[PDB]
Design a binder for this molecule. Structure first.
Ligand SMILES: Nc1nc2c(ncn2[C@H]2CC[C@@H](COP(=O)(O)OP(=O)(O)OP(=O)(O)O)O2)c(=O)[nH]1
Ligand code: NA
Length: 535
DNA sequence: GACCACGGCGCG
DNA sequence: CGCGCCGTGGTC
């Protein structure tokens, strides 16, 4: 709160103002610093940027990303946001955080610098006495912020011409399905309009309405509703296909090419470190954590993501990590034994109900393995397996019969969650879940599903994060790059010659990130594009 | 032009 | 379960 001349003393909190949220696209409008309750404002932000040794303050990573964009090696350090997020993962934004801990998120650089100063004091003290949250802050989050800033700055290479040609071809098939749909409907309408489609399917045609939408009570035309009506009329199959194509064209095929950065010639996403309730990362502007892969047209989209000339992509995927985290968290002997014997759990579980061994269909034990994690209901299983309701309800009983200890863990977690109001990851990351004692059943049980899923999902996020932190330094040694993280997968790019060495290494670092009662298995692939590298 | 709620859907 | 983005339909 004192007007001192730039530059600031070593180790001062910074407050910057950008023209827009994306650091890679943003103009730097103002720069300021605060140390010993004193504020300095820079005459010219870009020039003044070279003064700093490290970025400490609210949203440090963003300022570090922009610095790297300008060739400056300014690493991010302390960020009160990371502290607030560890106290309570509902602390996602500075607007929300400042308000909560005695400040006001402004649009001026100095006020932000001072907000960053006092907000760090208040929070760091709240953290003293929290051994395990401090270990996460120091050993995972703070260091991770730096790794992410390097991924954001690097970006990934995109095959623009390929997507541009794929757009024209996908456009022709869309015009095709549209013409057929119109015909089967006797007239044209906006097929992208959910409301107009509803009137056509259920009112003009005679089709039966299966379900209603949550907020407004309209008759749903969701995929789930259509797949059910799949044989009740030919038009719905043409519509499911039209949905797929228009979803992928408007979300990926069309907007991605226009997002290539001029200076880099690559595609840059943002890795949000303070966004989720479980401790996962999120990706935005654009979201690269949800690039299509499950359909044939999706796979054609992944081919667009390529390695620079002379480089290769290295794709590393943890196999069934959440399941293994569950085996470790619960202590289930039969579950542990599966991963211990190094035998395929899905076949293995499809032999606790059928065999054993290989002798119920694969995705039958698979859909349920994925389902126990979310608290999936019997009815939800029926639809996802095209199976009678009572066959789904029984498929779920043979599970808790085979692996009893998971049920005991679910119960234990809920009980303790009710007692102290939060649940924890293996490392102590917590999420406050208050509705565990709500008096409305639907509300209480929803809270319960968020509650016991979190320690699992959040522990896998912790394992992946720590793995990124340990892998980054080793990669920089071999002149390799970290490009993307997709929750339980990493994409790196490496020089053609070192590629295989980078793949063997990264695998070991990820597999030994943190030994559990069960081994961690990683699948690696190398290739000229994301689809090649995967598999 | 910005922003919003909604339904709907892509990924893990 | 956990995210982020799309078009539609709409306000300011
Ligand atoms: N495909 C799919 N993945 C999900 C779903 N819900 C969560 N996930 C996450 C968990 C793991 C990750 C990838 O799962 P995979 O398809 O690789 O499962 P997998 O064990 O490798 O199957 P497989 O052994 O047949 O290759 O996606 C879902 O509904 N579908
Ligand atoms: Na930061």
């Amino acid at each position: 709160l004192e007007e001192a001349p730039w530059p600031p003393p070593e180790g001062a909190f910074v407050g910057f103002v950008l023209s827009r949220k994306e650091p890679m696209w943003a103009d730097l409008l103002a720069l300021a610093a605060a140390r010993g309750g004193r504020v300095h404002r820079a005459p010219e932000p870009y020039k003044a940027l070279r003064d700093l040794k490290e970025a400490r303050g609210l949203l440090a990573k963003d300022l570090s990303v922009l610095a790297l964009r300008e060739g400056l090696g300014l690493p991010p350090g302390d960020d009160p946001m990371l502290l607030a997020y560890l106290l309570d993962p509902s602390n996602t934004t500075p607007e929300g955080v400042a308000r909560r801990y005695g400040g006001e998120w402004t649009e001026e650089a100095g006020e932000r610098a001072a907000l960053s100063e006092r907000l760090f004091a208040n929070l760091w003290g709240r953290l003293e006495g929290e051994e395990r949250l401090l270990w996460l802050y120091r050993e995972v989050e703070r260091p991770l912020s730096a790794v992410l800033a390097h991924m954001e700055a690097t970006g990934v290479r995109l095959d623009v011409a390929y997507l541009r040609a794929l757009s024209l071809e996908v456009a022709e098939e869309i015009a095709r399905l549209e013409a057929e749909v119109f015909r089967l409907a006797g007239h044209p309408f906006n097929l992208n309009s959910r409301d107009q489609l509803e009137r056509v399917l259920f009112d003009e045609l005679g089709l039966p309405a299966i379900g209603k939408t949550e907020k407004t009570g309209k008759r749903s035309t969701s995929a789930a509703v259509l797949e059910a009506l799949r044989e009740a009329h030919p038009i719905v199959e043409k519509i499911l296909q039209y949905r797929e194509l228009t979803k992928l064209k408007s979300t990926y095929i069309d907007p991605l090419p226009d997002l290539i950065h001029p200076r880099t010639g690559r595609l840059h996403t943002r890795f949000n470190q303070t966004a989720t309730a479980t401790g996962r990362l999120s990706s935005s502007d654009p979201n690269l954590q949800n690039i299509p892969v499950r359909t044939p047209l999706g796979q054609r989209i992944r081919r667009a993501f390529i390695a620079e000339e002379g480089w290769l992509l290295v794709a590393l995927d943890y196999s069934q990590i959440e399941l293994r985290v569950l085996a470790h968290l619960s202590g289930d002997e039969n579950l542990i034994r599966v991963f211990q014997e190094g035998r395929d759990i899905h076949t293995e579980t499809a032999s606790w109900m059928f065999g054993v061994p290989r002798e119920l269909m694969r995705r039958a034990a698979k859909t349920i393995n994925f389902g126990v994690l979310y608290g999936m209901s019997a009815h939800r299983l029926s639809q996802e397996l095209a199976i009678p309701y009572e066959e789904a309800q029984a498929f779920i009983e043979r599970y808790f019969q085979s692996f009893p200890k998971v049920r005991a863990w679910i119960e234990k977690t809920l009980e303790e969650g009710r007692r102290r109001g939060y649940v924890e990851t293996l490392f102590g990351r917590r999420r406050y879940v208050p509705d565990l004692e709500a008096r409305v059943k639907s509300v209480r049980e929803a809270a319960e599903r968020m509650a016991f899923n979190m320690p699992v999902q959040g522990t896998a996020a912790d394992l992946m994060k720590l793995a990124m932190v340990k892998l980054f330094p080793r990669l920089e040694e071999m002149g390799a790059r970290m490009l993307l993280q997709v929750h339980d997968e990493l994409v790196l790019e490496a020089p053609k010659e070192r590629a295989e060495a980078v793949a063997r290494l990264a695998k070991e670092v990820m597999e030994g990130v943190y030994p559990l009662a069960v081994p961690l298995e990683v699948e690696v692939g190398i290739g000229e594009d994301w689809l090649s590298a995967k598999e």
